[PDB]
Amino acid sequence: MIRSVVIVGGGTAGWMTASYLKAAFDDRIDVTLVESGNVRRIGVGEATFSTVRHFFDYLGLDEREWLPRCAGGYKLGIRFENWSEPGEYFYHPFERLRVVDGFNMAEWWLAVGTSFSEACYLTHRLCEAKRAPRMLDGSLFASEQRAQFPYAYHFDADEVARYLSEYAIARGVRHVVDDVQHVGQDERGWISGVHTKQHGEISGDLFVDCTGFRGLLINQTLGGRFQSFSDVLPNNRAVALRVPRENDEDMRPYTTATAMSAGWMWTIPLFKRDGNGYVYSDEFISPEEAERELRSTVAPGRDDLEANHIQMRIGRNERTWINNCVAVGLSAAFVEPLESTGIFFIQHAIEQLVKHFPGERWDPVLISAYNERMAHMVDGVKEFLVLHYKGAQREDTPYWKAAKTRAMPDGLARKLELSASHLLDEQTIYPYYHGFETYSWITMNLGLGIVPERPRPALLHMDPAPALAEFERLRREGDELIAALPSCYEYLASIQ
Amino acid sequence: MIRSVVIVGGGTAGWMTASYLKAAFDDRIDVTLVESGNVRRIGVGEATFSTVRHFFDYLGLDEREWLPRCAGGYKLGIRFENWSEPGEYFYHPFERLRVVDGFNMAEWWLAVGSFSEACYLTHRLCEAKRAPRMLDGSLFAEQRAQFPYAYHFDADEVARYLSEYAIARGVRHVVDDVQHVGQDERGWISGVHTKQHGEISGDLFVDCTGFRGLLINQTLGGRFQSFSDVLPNNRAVALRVPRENDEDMRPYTTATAMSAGWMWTIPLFKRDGNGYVYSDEFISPEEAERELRSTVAPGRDDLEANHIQMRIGRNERTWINNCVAVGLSAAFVEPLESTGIFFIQHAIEQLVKHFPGERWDPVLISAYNERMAHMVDGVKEFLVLHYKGAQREDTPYWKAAKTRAMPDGLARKLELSASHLLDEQTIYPYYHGFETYSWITMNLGLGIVPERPRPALLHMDPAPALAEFERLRREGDELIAALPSCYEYLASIQ
Ligand SMILES: Cc1cc2nc3c(=O)[nH]c(=O)nc-3n(C[C@H](O)[C@H](O)[C@H](O)COP(=O)(O)OP(=O)(O)OC[C@H]3O[C@@H](n4cnc5c(N)ncnc54)[C@H](O)[C@@H]3O)c2cc1C
Numbered sequence: 001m002i003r004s005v006v007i008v009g010g011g012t013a014g015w016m017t018a019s020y021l022k023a024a025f026d027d028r029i030d031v032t033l034v035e036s037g038n039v040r041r042i043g044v045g046e047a048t049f050s051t052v053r054h055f056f057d058y059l060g061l062d063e064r065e066w067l068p069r070c071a072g073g074y075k076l077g078i079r080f081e082n083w084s085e086p087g088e089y090f091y092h093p094f095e096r097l098r099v100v101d102g103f104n105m106a107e108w109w110l111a112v113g114t115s116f117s118e119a120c121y122l123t124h125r126l127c128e129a130k131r132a133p134r135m136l137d138g139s140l141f142a143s144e145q146r147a148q149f150p151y152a153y154h155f156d157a158d159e160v161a162r163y164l165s166e167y168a169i170a171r172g173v174r175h176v177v178d179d180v181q182h183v184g185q186d187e188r189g190w191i192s193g194v195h196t197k198q199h200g201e202i203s204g205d206l207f208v209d210c211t212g213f214r215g216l217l218i219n220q221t222l223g224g225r226f227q228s229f230s231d232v233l234p235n236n237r238a239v240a241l242r243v244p245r246e247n248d249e250d251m252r253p254y255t256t257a258t259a260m261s262a263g264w265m266w267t268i269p270l271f272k273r274d275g276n277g278y279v280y281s282d283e284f285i286s287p288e289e290a291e292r293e294l295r296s297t298v299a300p301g302r303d304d305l306e307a308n309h310i311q312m313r314i315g316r317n318e319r320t321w322i323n324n325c326v327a328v329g330l331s332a333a334f335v336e337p338l339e340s341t342g343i344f345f346i347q348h349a350i351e352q353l354v355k356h357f358p359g360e361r362w363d364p365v366l367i368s369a370y371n372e373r374m375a376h377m378v379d380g381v382k383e384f385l386v387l388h389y390k391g392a393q394r395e396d397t398p399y400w401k402a403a404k405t406r407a408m409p410d411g412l413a414r415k416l417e418l419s420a421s422h423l424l425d426e427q428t429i430y431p432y433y434h435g436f437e438t439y440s441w442i443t444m445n446l447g448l449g450i451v452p453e454r455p456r457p458a459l460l461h462m463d464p465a466p467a468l469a470e471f472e473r474l475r476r477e478g479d480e481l482i483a484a485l486p487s488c489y490e491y492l493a494s495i496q
Numbered sequence: 497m498i499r500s501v502v503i504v505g506g507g508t509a510g511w512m513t514a515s516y517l518k519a520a521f522d523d524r525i526d527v528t529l530v531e532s533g534n535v536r537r538i539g540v541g542e543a544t545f546s547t548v549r550h551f552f553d554y555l556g557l558d559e560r561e562w563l564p565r566c567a568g569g570y571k572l573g574i575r576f577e578n579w580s581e582p583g584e585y586f587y588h589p590f591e592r593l594r595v596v597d598g599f600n601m602a603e604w605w606l607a608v609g610s611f612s613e614a615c616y617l618t619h620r621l622c623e624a625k626r627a628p629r630m631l632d633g634s635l636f637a638e639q640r641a642q643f644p645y646a647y648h649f650d651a652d653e654v655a656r657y658l659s660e661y662a663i664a665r666g667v668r669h670v671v672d673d674v675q676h677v678g679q680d681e682r683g684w685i686s687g688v689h690t691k692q693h694g695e696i697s698g699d700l701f702v703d704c705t706g707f708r709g710l711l712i713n714q715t716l717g718g719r720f721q722s723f724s725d726v727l728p729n730n731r732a733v734a735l736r737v738p739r740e741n742d743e744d745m746r747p748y749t750t751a752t753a754m755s756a757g758w759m760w761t762i763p764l765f766k767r768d769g770n771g772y773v774y775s776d777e778f779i780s781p782e783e784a785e786r787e788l789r790s791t792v793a794p795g796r797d798d799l800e801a802n803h804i805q806m807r808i809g810r811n812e813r814t815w816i817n818n819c820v821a822v823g824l825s826a827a828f829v830e831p832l833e834s835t836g837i838f839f840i841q842h843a844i845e846q847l848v849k850h851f852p853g854e855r856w857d858p859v860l861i862s863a864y865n866e867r868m869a870h871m872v873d874g875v876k877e878f879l880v881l882h883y884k885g886a887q888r889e890d891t892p893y894w895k896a897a898k899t900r901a902m903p904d905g906l907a908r909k910l911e912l913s914a915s916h917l918l919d920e921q922t923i924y925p926y927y928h929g930f931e932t933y934s935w936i937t938m939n940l941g942l943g944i945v946p947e948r949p950r951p952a953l954l955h956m957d958p959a960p961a962l963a964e965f966e967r968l969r970r971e972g973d974e975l976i977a978a979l980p981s982c983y984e985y986l987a988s989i990q
């Protein structure tokens with residue numbers, strides 16, 4: 001049985017790990033987290049995926065407690081703007097499709113359908129009317145019912161790290177602020193300790209690499225091989241800003257992904273401000289050009305706002321667990337934030353680390369099974385993301401023209417062939433766990449313009465009444481909800 | 497749209513198909529079923545899988561209506577006898593494992609704990625021979641998914657019952673032999689030519705002719721892929737054995753390992769169904785008949801034995817041109833996990849979903865074929881796991897099972913399983929009827945057991961899981977005291 005964990009890095013990954021380990025094992029694990037006082041955290045990572053409520057539940061934290069305290073907001077979905085038709089948009093919401101007489105509402109929409117998201121999802125209305133997912137009395141709008149509309153969150157990246165470090169430290173995590181200068185290895189190549197500038201050697205049984213893109217343990221010490229995805233997903237840089245909203249009250253309960261001339265831009269509404277960034281490929285546009293394009297769109301004349309330029313490491317380690325070291329966060333893998341998966345990868349890496357926790361024997365088969373899961377997790381998203389670029393109909397710049405013909409991962413060709421005939425399902429999407437469900441694959445395809453040539457032939461043999469009564473039911477439930485629900489900001493104000 | 501379906505074959509496959517199509521499309525589909533008056537149905541296929549309730553629900557039939565009428569009983573799971581330690585047994589039940597603090601009861605059992613007895617309510621119900629219903633008809637536990645119990649029924653009666661259902665709903669019934677299958681200039685089926693009713697044509701043809709594969713294999717040249725290299729059982733001998741005491745009725749199938757295969761016991765309302773599944777490379781058809789009779793029906797030579805040659809494997813494609821194979825014509829594996837009728841149901845459900853329009857869509861058809869292939873391949877792999885987990889080594893047959901070649905992917909599942917339990921991510925990843933608990937339950941019961949408990953559990957409070965084991969033990973106690981016997985309940989609804 002092993003006793004102690006040493007985490008290197010104090011970004012969102014480090015502090016999520018420290019928190020979760022203490023929540024899981026309490027006093028049956030010793031945890032130390034070492035982080036540099038001079039190497040900054042990435043500074044971004046402000047939108048989350050639908051699994052994140054489980055992370056906070058596991059920690060014993062209600063959203064009323066943790067959300068104001070991370071200066072956050074609600075994420076009901078993502079609004080995709082300008083990807084295909086210009087001025088046009090759709091939502092990818094956190095909401096499962098209803099099923100009528102064996103077929104989901106997407107199939108029926110194609111046969112008897114108003115845009116797809118609008119006809120099929122309550123969430124669409126909530127986004128348009130800028131509603132909170134809760135009534136003022138704190139009851140969920142569905143009124144588990146939380147799974148049927150698995151909304152996520154926006155939060156401030158500084159605050160969440162600050163908040164979780166306090167959570168972890170309150171629970172006995174030893175905190176060291178220092179630079180690791182060298183990582184020791186025993187005669188078998190296993191990590192023996194990390195040598196700091198002022199605190200000597202810090203040893204332990206298990207080491208968690210949370211050093212970001214740098215991969216200081218997993219790559220620079222252990223020689224882990226990093227598999228780049230630049231061949232299919234070229235975006236390799238970002239430029240970020242923190243932009244105050246002219247009107248705080250005007251707060252959207254969703255992230256916006258807006259296609260730009262050489263990439264795309266995020267808008268993440270927080271309680272006090274927006275987060276903004278342009279994800280781009282430097283083969284098509286320079287870092288200044290991108291900064292200029294970004295500022296022009298979301299912050300004209302606001303040169304007091306400092307831009308944060310980021311070089312992204314896109315792809316994954318072949319193995320995120322090597323010897324006694326596990327990489328969590330940007331050190332393990334990263335794909336561009338088009339579907340807000342970075343924090344999801346962290347949560348899933350940590351939840352599966354607890355499941356695959358080593359005993360004094362360090363069982364290689366259990367480690368191997370952990371590595372497979374993490375590989376599948378990222379490869380599924382990678383494929384899902386390439387599908388975004390293949391579905392995007394705009395062709396107006398060298399960038400968008402090149403996205404159309406660029407090589408694809410194995411498997412996607414088949415998914416596109418299928419999709420031109422009929423909708424993807426549980427059996428034809430990526431088959432291993434990667435966060436996303438069928439509705440997400442379908443919703444992107446239909447929003448972007450990858451549509452079956454014709455409706456499902458079976459539906460012509462069937463009574464359309466039950467599905468038409470369902471579309472009407474959705475339309476009426478939507479009407480009632482936007483009338484009864486407070487705004488996104490209103491509800492958040494009431495719980496601050 | 498297409499208008500008409502012609503089904504060839506009136507076994508369980510033909511009639512399930514006819515029934516389901518009418519249930520699905522009512523008067524928006526014309527259906528004709530043609531079946532031989534002289535080529536007998538297989539005569540077996542008496543246990544079902546957990547999915548089967550959905551088939552009957554879809555048809556609009558409550559179990560109280562259909563079950564006594566098919567002379568059936570309850571299947572709470574399968575009892576595996578003599579597979580590893582001799583005289584030893586365990587249950588593979590239709591019951592999901594409870595989860596405590598992020599780990600299922602199997603994991604906890606390994607850390608703090610027989611397996612089936614500790615983890616499943618169904619184990620007690622089987623031992624005490626209970627019905628899954630109280631006399632007022634309420635379920636013992638929707639709550640139906642948590643304990644997805646299935647059924648036993650008489651194979652003659654179910655065909656008889658479903659043909660009536662379908663015919664009442666406008667299925668045209670023809671009793672004749674198909675002598676020739678016509679094809680058009682594209683190799684599509686144009687009609688079936690019968691001995692006395694001329695040509696019967698339609699848009700879609702469903703091959704329900706059994707192992708024969710009259711349309712899909714003999715006419716269309718579909719290729720059959722054999723599984724004999726990994727699952728050599730190629731024959732069966734069956735009996736219909738009356739129970740000395742009808743009241744003594746088990747709510748489960750028994751799979752008993754024998755010298756050169758295994759034997760099923762399926763308790764029906766009036767009688768048992770019995771059979772020995774074997775490989776003729778290790779035992780002759782009469783040796784097997786002698787071994788069967790000796791075990792379940794000593795001295796009862798008045799009972800006629802049904803000897804069957806099984807075609808084990810699957811068609812590469814079950815849907816070719818305008819013809820879809822359903823049932824034994826499509827695929828078959830030995831009935832060790834009662835999957836034949838499941839394969840039919842799933843084939844038919846997916847046929848409705850993949851139903852063709854007037855414009856035939858090769859991509860939709862290809863997606864149908866992938867699902868049918870995965871369905872059977874998943875079960876194939878799961879069954880080889882039974883033979884690999886069986887620890888008995890007492891005959892040439894059991895010795896050979898130990899070293900026989902395996903399907904791709906199973907070696908990995910066995911390496912994993914010696915380390916820790918299989919899960920949703922490491923079992924066969926495509927739909928094949930079975931869930932994780934089934935894979936786990938078979939491993940633990942047969943004796944493929946992680947070397948040690950999961951190390952994470954040593955860092956955790958065992959109290960919640962121990963309180964759960966106790967809760968299960970107490971709920972079990974209460975259920976066997978309150979539930980009527982399997983026979984008692986069935987008697988009350990006859
Ligand atoms: C442009 C961009 C946009 C993103 N958007 C999203 C999003 O919308 N949603 C989402 O979920 N994710 C997003 N991500 C991912 C998100 O930022 C990360 O998942 C999250 O911030 C965790 O980062 P990290 O902890 O792994 O790395 P970092 O923040 O880089 O942390 C590295 C830590 O290691 C420390 N360190 C480095 N070297 C040493 C050393 N020598 N000794 C001691 N300490 C050391 C540093 O001091 C720091 O504490 C985005 C990423 C990028 C690049």
Ligand SMILES: Cc1cc2nc3c(=O)[nH]c(=O)nc-3n(C[C@H](O)[C@H](O)[C@H](O)COP(=O)(O)OP(=O)(O)OC[C@H]3O[C@@H](n4cnc5c(N)ncnc54)[C@H](O)[C@@H]3O)c2cc1C
Nearest residue numbers: 505506507509532538541674705706732823824831836837
């Ligand atoms: C030994 C054994 C045990 C089994 N146990 C189980 C079990 O426990 N549980 C389970 O779910 N499944 C079991 N199965 C499978 C089960 O028997 C079948 O799934 C089910 O009976 C359906 O069979 P079928 O309709 O495909 O074939 P068949 O019963 O053989 O039907 C063939 C039909 O085609 C007709 N036909 C053939 N040729 C012509 C022609 N020339 N013209 C007109 N009609 C023709 C015949 O008349 C007949 O109606 C078992 C199978 C075997 C062999």
Ligand SMILES: [Cl-]
Nearest residue numbers: 102425426849
């Ligand atoms: Cl489905």
Ligand SMILES: [Cl-]
Nearest residue numbers: 337340341342
């Ligand atoms: Cl991300």
Ligand SMILES: [Cl-]
Nearest residue numbers: 355598919920
């Ligand atoms: Cl899990």
Ligand SMILES: [Cl-]
Nearest residue numbers: 831834835836
């Ligand atoms: Cl079977």
